[PDB]
């Protein structure tokens, strides 16, 4: 009776066993069909040239339930090599996940995979737990969506959650944009993968945007070279920080939305006055798109400008931020005190799928 932990993201699945310190499998959240009859995860990616890819999770939400079932089946049987009917399964969901979506996940786990028990946790909350906290505000930026999730004593506060429809995939696309201004042409799906590697390796958040652009314009001290797979070597400059600057200025890609520093402040300002200090002192970064060097310092600067002068602002950026959601789930699911909170098959059978709201919050 060992529990499984599955963290389903728009871009990557992280799956493993509760009590482990790392997920056993990390693979793209993709289903490919020929351009057998379908391929999932790491097959479908290494075999990409002969496949058309579909992403069942978009913008943090499951949009294709048939292909999401394939991802789950592939997670259980191919990657983890377990029979789901023998294991309690902890799943994760985005903040403000629609009611009908959570019920559909629950129904599938119980009626299709016949799990003995399951639980649905909000990803941001698991990241807060992984950092040793039960109170704080989480900035979760992944591949498809970015959220500010204030959390007080294990309860995410849905009225104060902020959502920015901008994350790693958009930043990759934006870096493809602006690299063309330097004269480089990255168009194909394989070239997108290269630009994503450029972003993950060379990009950073400037502490002050205008100063950094002036530095980049008057010298080459911020330029960095990158070897393409074919051996050719390109040089990138102010794109290093112009790409993630979009998080703070979404209008760079034409979004009429406030940047992540302002949404953090507004989310705090929608919480009870009583708890705001604890939120300001516990700003936890999570997700792959918060990995940029310098993002913590910039958030500290920008929130200090918005918050009252006496407030203490701390930004926590743990080193395993790509995996904090999974680690938090591994911790939670393996706690002795957690076990009464699994939804059991009997409770599901007696209440219907609406049991997930009663028990997961």
């Amino acid at each position: 009776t060992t529990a499984l932990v599955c963290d389903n993201g728009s871009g990557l699945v992280k799956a493993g066993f509760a009590g482990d310190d790392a997920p056993r499998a990390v693979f793209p959240s993709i289903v490919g069909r020929p351009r057998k009859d379908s391929y999932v995860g790491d097959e479908a990616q290494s075999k990409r040239g002969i496949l058309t890819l579909k992403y069942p999770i978009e913008h943090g939400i499951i949009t294709n339930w048939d292909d999401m079932e394939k991802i789950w089946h592939h997670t259980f049987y191919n990657e983890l090599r377990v029979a789901p009917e023998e294991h309690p399964t902890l799943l994760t969901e985005a903040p403000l996940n629609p009611k009908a979506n959570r019920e559909k996940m629950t129904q599938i786990m119980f009626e299709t995979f016949n799990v003995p028990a399951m639980y649905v946790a909000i990803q941001a909350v698991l990241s807060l737990y992984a950092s040793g906290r039960t109170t704080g505000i989480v900035l979760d930026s992944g591949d498809g969506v970015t959220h500010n999730v204030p959390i007080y004593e294990g309860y995410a506060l849905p009225h104060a959650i902020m959502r920015l429809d901008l994350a790693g995939r958009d930043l990759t696309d934006y870096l493809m944009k602006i690299l063309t201004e330097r004269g480089y042409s990255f168009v194909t799906t394989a070239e997108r993968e290269i630009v994503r590697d450029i972003k993950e390796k060379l990009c950073y958040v400037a502490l002050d945007f205008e100063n950094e652009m002036a530095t980049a314009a008057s010298s080459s001290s911020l330029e960095k070279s990158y070897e393409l797979p074919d051996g050719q070597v390109i040089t990138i400059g102010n794109e290093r920080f112009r790409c993630p600057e979009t998080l703070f200025q979404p209008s760079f890609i034409g979004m009429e939305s406030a940047g992540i520093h302002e949404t953090t402040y507004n989310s705090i300002m929608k919480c009870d006055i009583d708890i705001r200090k604890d939120l300001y002192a516990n700003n936890v970064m999570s997700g792959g798109t918060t990995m940029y060097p310098g993002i913590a310092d910039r958030m500290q600067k920008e929130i200090t400008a918005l918050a009252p002068s006496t407030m203490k602002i701390k930004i926590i950026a743990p080193p395993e931020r790509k995996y904090s959601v999974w680690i938090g789930g591994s911790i939670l699911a393996s706690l002795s005190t957690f076990q009464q909170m699994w939804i059991t098959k009997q409770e599901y059978d007696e209440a219907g799928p609406s049991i997930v709201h009663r028990k997961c919050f």
């Binding site: 039960t134 004593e153 706690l335 957690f338």
Partner: peptide, 22 residues
């Protein structure tokens, strides 16, 4: 309260060492 015992466990259980290396 059952929630608080879980929250207390999350903060001070020591779970993060207790995770097996894999």
């Amino acid at each position: 309260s059952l929630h608080s015992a879980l929250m207390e466990a999350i903060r001070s259980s020591g779970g993060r060492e207790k995770l097996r290396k894999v």
